[PDB]
């Protein structure tokens, strides 16, 4: 997703499997950030990642 | 029990004393020069003992004219300086020999200059945000109570005007003094701002150090030490706020770097000292707030090649929370007091440490000047009206916020004759919010400068 | 009680004998009373300054004829610290560092005798900088302002005209020096260190074609000379130059270069055996610039409100600003006249670097006339360094910058000036104010020196009235301005360019 | 090395232990001030061999 | 519009590359430095 | 009543006197080889005293075969160099004995190699151009006939071939007398000048000398000071003007840089002796033409790793009048003579 | 030196020699590591004077 974002910041239109693949890409960024002070119990670490 | 002058090398010294009375490390000695031409009193302090009673020593003045075997008197304390509120309002060398009038102070309490930091018990748990009054810093860029401020900047650039602002801020809004430390200041700018601060009847607040660059070394590495004994004791027996300006580190961990090397120490990586990090952070450390009062900092911090790696200030850059820059760009506009709000930062600016409608206000107000900032190309090539709409009323917005960040500071009552405002935080962040959402737009910029607070907006607004 | 008394009991001048000597160094043994730099002399009749002071032996270094020197020879002490010569008997002579004349005139009239390492002006003795120094180049009074009392210093490379700087700013003096107002009346001192001969002969020589020989002193410390000399040079350049400052005269000085300079007192610290630090200086270097430079002050009128002004050059490696000396001169000096090699070939001559060079001074350094010209002019000139690569696409350029475009061009060409003529400040102002009033607009880019030096010389043939009203009032007032606007115009329709096109 | 000297005892023990070194290049530096006062001398960016 | 947006990128890309230069150049200043000191600094403990 | 050798390492060699016997700086002595096929006399110059009757002195021959306490015979006076207009069209060693003719210049007045540079009143600047016929050269770097002129270049960028040009434009042409000096150059291109100057009739008027690169560090040194004295006696006993070439003139401080480290002085920035400035100005500042006699100094000077910051070029540049600086990137452009169009300058285009 | 002292028994006696030293950087450290075991001080790079 990473290398794909570098690519594709100054293409303007792409295939679909590229879209889908950075759009699912840019969903799991946003997903692994949290605050500060906020440990989550792996039981809950699992959740959030499935 | 007096001590011999045995060797001479430069500003160098080495002393041979009786076997029984050879001095404590970091004390000062004193002898004498009896050339007419040159006639001094000479201050050394005590670096190693070199076995054989030997003592290595540095002078705080030039060597000229010493000769060997004259008698050596030890003081048996560290080199001293006065303190005291008679302190305020004079100009002294490190030694703390007064500049203005000779021989005065020599009746007050002395303290050592070389002192323990605060115990770790009495240490502050967390930091407090600093409530200075003026609108670009408490919203941009936060001071933390106790801590350190880099400043950049230089001539043409207000920045003798801020720190004649920020004495009068520490003066009435806190009942504190200042402290000004003069390391390697040139004698000219030591002069002027002597002059500037008498002139705007400051310096009555103020204590003054001066190591100046025409002196050896040791006395430019000692002054930063001396400034912040004098603010040890307002902070710990007077019970004050102190105020501590240094002007400029990177010439305190320079002259530490030089007298490494005329003791003849290995030198590290691009030639500082090897001690340089403790070196530093024996001073650092004893700039802080305890059993709830506080020595607050500015630093003014030369950077070499300006690279943020090199040790000395990779170094500085550890210790300090805050950086202010003073831009040229943004004097030019007339804005006062010319503090950059895109290239200056700070540390205490979190969710957590001030409220969650601050962090969000100074998010946006950074977001549209930084729109602004990537527009002013296309303004100054093709000009306003090959901008859309949409931008175009971002602009409107952007151009009120940049103006909206001036104030009418203490510092110009001397010329203006109106008096100096200061915003309370919980009005200036209200009023930034309004005026990123455009509720002013129909305002002229004329309306926004120099302008106080929102209120002062209102009067302005209806003057116009 | 008894040893006390034993050792009360038990309780002419004194002659050294030379242990050792190489490479321009010598150590003397005895001397039990002498001080650090107290001048030593030799049987040979040649001196030594006994700079560092061992448990056993002085470490002495020799100035100039070191071949005389062998082991077991005596050595007298002179009672006194180093000292120089000074007076006004200095001024159009040539000087060796110990002030004895070298050009073979004839012997100097010395008035009073100097040490060369006494205290500089304390923060109390000074006053605020607040006087002109005219330099009499566009590119520097303009834009980087030198006021009598300012450290300003000329950093370039090599061949890029510091020299010439100097130079100029020595010969634009004597349109002072002719009235007789010691208020006016600038002194100049120049420091050659580690020149060649031939170089100090042609320096010598340009003086002489200007007249400045009446009132400007060479020290010499040509590059034949013992590093012990070249050390000495700037200390006694400024030695010579405190007697006339302390007298309430005004005094300039050119240190021409501190970088030979700092590589004379490296050889002599690392002869010595001293610890060497970075780039093989040893710790002091700072403190040898500072102690030097930091002599240069304005005093106040309780001390005769005499002043000293500093141009210290340096030369720069590669244009790299970063090694040590450039950056200890940097840190100490007031402001940084940077000397360009590219802008010296692309045609800027002199190269001043104008996008970086700055003076902490400002202002408070020129007249008001240069002021309310002057004002704009770096504003000017760096929105023209931004608009610069668009000169390939000036139609597309909107033209309310396309004005901005043709104006930093034609200010560009009215900063160019040829060596040898510096201009006094009445026609500086006139200069200026043709460009930043847009009056040179209408002329074509190539023509506008020639159209300059021709208005400048009809202005004073027919109009010397406006020179005068300038010089006299330092105000350029609205009956002067309608004037010159007035004549520019009439000069405008006698003028040609070099395509034969008017310019009306 | 206090920290793991004080961590270790538990660990023979058959505790668990958790070190963090905060931080270890500062530690660097210490090292590189005492061997450079003690006048070894110094390999690549400073460091002691 | 095309040439604009490659531009713009090519700008970007160019400003990057004049800072990791800039960050390489000054990694081989220090070392350059450090190195000639190292070298000066044996010399003299030799003697 | 005569020295003995104490120390040995390499080029350096420590000698003790008798109490009063001590000699003074820059005395040539003398020693003894003894051992077959390397049996000569040696000739080692005075540098330093040590103290305690103890001098430091640097072997002009390869000191290979000395043996510790030989005799060292102090001759009283430095290095001599023969000097006469018989000089002329021989091919001297640094120690001014002729190559192609042994033995030849012993009854020759003979001058001391060191002496002071000329007093300042006796300089006035040179002003008459020099003519070459060279196109860069004559429009960019214009030469002074009297000055000091140098090319300047990295190793390999052909300051050998510039040279042998210069002789074959002006000295062909030039009605006065030349001397060269083989400063540390290749043997092989100093004989290919000599046969050329012979193939042609300017030998008659021309003197070699030659230190080349094969022999140790003492002739490095002096055969410069041994080539400038000869100039010297031209220009000021017969007033006849003189053309002085000089390559390569950086050999001259490397030398000395090579021999630093043994005499005892802590190196400078980036490995050179800390004399250098002082070292070098003391001969520079000798080739200057006195008013009313001519000399024309055309010098090539090395720059190590093509570093034109590097002290020894850094501290050359100040002693030059035109400079023609070389430079390896338009050597590689295929441009030849391969001059630096724009760092290349000259103080007589005015 | 034995390689060219090999060459030159040959090369005065009228022989054509061809000397390849492969390679001179190995020689030149070597020399380096002769000269620092006997204390010599080191010129610049840490090469013999």
């Not at chain 2, 106790?146 to 801020?169: D, P, S």
């Not at chain 2, 500037?196 to 204590?207: G, M, P, S, Y």
Request: some cysteine; glycine content about 8%; aromatic content about 6%.
């Amino acid at each position: 997703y990473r290398e794909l974002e570098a690519f594709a910041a100054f293409a303007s239109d792409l295939d679909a499997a590229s879209k889908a693949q950075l759009d699912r890409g840019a969903r799991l960024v946003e997903l692994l950030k949290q605050p500060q002070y906020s440990p989550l119990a792996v039981e809950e670490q699992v959740v959030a990642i499935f | 029990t007096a001590g011999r002058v045995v060797r001479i090398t430069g500003p160098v010294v080495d002393v041979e004393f009786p076997r029984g009375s050879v001095p404590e490390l970091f004390n000062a000695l004193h002898a004498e020069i009896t050339f007419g031409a040159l006639a001094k009193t000479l201050t050394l302090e005590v670096a190693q003992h070199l076995g054989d009673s030997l003592v290595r020593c540095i002078s705080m003045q030039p060597t000229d004219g010493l000769v060997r075997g004259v008698e050596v008197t030890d003081t048996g304390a560290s080199i001293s300086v006065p303190v005291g509120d008679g302190v305020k309002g004079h100009v002294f060398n490190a030694l703390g020999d007064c500049l203005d009038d000779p021989g005065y102070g020599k009746d007050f309490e002395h303290w050592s200059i070389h002192r323990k930091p605060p115990a770790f018990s009495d240490l502050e748990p967390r930091t407090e945000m600093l409530e200075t009054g003026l609108k670009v810093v408490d919203l941009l860029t936060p001071y933390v109570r106790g801590g350190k401020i880099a400043l950049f900047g230089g001539a043409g650039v207000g920045k003798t005007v801020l720190i004649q602002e920020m004495i009068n801020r520490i003066a009435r809004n806190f009942g504190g003094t200042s402290v000004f430390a003069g390391v390697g200041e040139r004698t000219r700018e030591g002069n002027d701002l002597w002059v500037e601060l008498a002139d705007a009847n400051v310096l009555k607040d103020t204590a003054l150090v001066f190591g100046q660059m025409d002196e050896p070394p040791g006395t430019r590495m000692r002054v930063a030490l001396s400034a912040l004994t004098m603010a040890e004791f307002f902070r710990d027996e007077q019970g004050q706020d102190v105020l501590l300006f240094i002007d400029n580190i990177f010439r305190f961990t320079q002259a530490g770097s030089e007298v490494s090397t005329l003791l003849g120490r290995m030198p590290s990586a691009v030639g500082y000292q090897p001690t340089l990090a403790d070196e530093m952070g024996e001073l650092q450390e004893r700039i802080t707030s305890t059993r709830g009062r506080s020595i607050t900092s500015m630093q003014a911090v030369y950077v070499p090649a300006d690279d943020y790696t090199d040790p000395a200030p990779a170094t500085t850059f550890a210790h300090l929370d805050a950086t202010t820059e003073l831009s040229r760009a943004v004097f030019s506009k007339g804005i006062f007091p010319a503090v950059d709000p895109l290239a200056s930062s700070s540390t205490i600016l979190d969710p957590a440490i001030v409220g969650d409608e601050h962090y969000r206000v100074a998010q946006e107000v950074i977001r549209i000047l930084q729109r602004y900032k990537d527009l002013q190309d296309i303004i100054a090539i093709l000009g306003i009206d090959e901008l859309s709409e949409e931008d175009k009323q971002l602009v409107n917005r952007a151009r009120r916020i940049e103006r909206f960040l001036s104030q009418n500071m203490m510092a110009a009552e001397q010329f203006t004759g109106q008096p100096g405002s200061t915003v309370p935080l919980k009005e200036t962040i209200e009023a930034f919010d309004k005026l990123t959402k455009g509720e002013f737009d129909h305002l002229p910029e004329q309306a926004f400068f120099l302008i106080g607070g929102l209120d002062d907006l209102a009067k302005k607004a209806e003057s116009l | 009680x008894x040893x006390x008394x034993x050792x009360x009991x038990x309780x002419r001048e004194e002659i050294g004998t030379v242990i050792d000597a190489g490479d321009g160094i010598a150590h003397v043994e005895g001397l039990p009373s002498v001080m650090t730099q107290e001048l030593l002399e030799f049987p040979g009749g040649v001196l030594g300054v006994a700079l560092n002071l061992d448990e056993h032996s002085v470490g002495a270094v020799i100035l100039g004829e070191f071949e005389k020197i062998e082991e077991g020879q005596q050595v007298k002490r002179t009672g006194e610290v180093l000292s120089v010569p000074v007076g006004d008997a200095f001024l159009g002579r040539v000087v060796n560092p110990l002030g004895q004349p070298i050009d073979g005139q004839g012997d100097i009239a010395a008035e009073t005798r100097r040490a060369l390492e006494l205290q500089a002006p304390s923060v109390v003795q000074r006053q605020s900088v607040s006087e002109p120094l005219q330099t009499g180049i566009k590119a520097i009074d303009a834009m980087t302002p030198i006021g009598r009392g300012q450290r300003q210093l000329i950093i370039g490379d090599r061949k890029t005209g510091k020299t010439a700087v100097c130079v100029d700013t020595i010969l634009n003096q004597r349109e002072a020096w002719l009235t007789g107002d010691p208020k006016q009346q600038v002194r100049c001192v120049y420091v050659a260190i580690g020149q060649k001969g031939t170089t100090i002969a042609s320096v010598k020589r340009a003086l002489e074609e200007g007249g400045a020989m009446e009132y400007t002193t060479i020290v010499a410390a040509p590059a034949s000379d013992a590093a012990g000399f070249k050390w000495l040079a700037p200390y006694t350049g400024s030695a010579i130059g405190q007697h006339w400052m302390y007298n309430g005269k005004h005094v300039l000085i050119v240190f021409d270069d501190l970088s030979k300079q700092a590589d004379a007192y490296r050889a002599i610290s690392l002869l010595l055996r001293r610890p060497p630090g970075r780039e093989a200086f040893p710790g002091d270097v700072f403190y040898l610039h500072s102690r030097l430079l930091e002599r240069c002050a304005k005093l106040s009128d309780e001390l005769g409100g005499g002043s000293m002004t500093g141009l210290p050059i340096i030369e720069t490696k590669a244009n790299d600003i970063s090694a040590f000396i450039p950056t200890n001169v940097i840190s100490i000096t007031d402001g940084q006249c940077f000397l360009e090699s590219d802008l010296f070939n692309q045609g800027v001559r002199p190269a001043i670097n104008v996008g970086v060079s700055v003076s902490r001074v400002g202002g408070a350094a020129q007249i008001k006339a240069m002021k309310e010209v002057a004002g704009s002019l770096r504003l000017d000139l760096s929105q023209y360094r931004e608009l610069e690569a668009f000169a390939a696409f000036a139609s597309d350029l909107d033209a309310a910058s396309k004005a901005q475009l043709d104006r930093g061009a034609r200010l560009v060409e009215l900063l160019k000036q040829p060596q040898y003529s510096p201009l006094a400040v009445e026609e500086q102002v006139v200069a200026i104010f043709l460009g930043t009033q847009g009056h040179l607009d209408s002329v074509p880019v190539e023509d506008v020196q020639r159209f300059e030096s021709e208005l400048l010389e009809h202005v004073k043939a027919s109009h010397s009235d406006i020179f005068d009203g300038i010089r006299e009032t330092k105000k350029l007032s609205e009956e002067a301005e309608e004037k010159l606007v007035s004549v520019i115009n009439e000069f405008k329709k006698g003028f040609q360019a070099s395509d034969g096109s008017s310019v009306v | 090395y206090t920290g793991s000297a004080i961590g270790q005892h538990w660990m023979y023990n058959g505790k668990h232990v958790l070190i963090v070194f905060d931080d270890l290049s500062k530690q660097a530096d210490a090292y590189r001030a005492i061997s450079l006062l003690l006048r070894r001398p110094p390999g690549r960016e400073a460091f002691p061999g | 519009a095309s040439r604009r947006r490659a531009m713009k990128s090519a700008t970007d890309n160019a400003d990057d590359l004049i800072k990791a230069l800039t960050l390489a150049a000054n990694r081989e200043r220090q070392a350059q430095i450090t190195q000639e000191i190292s070298e000066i600094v044996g010399g003299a403990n030799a003697l």
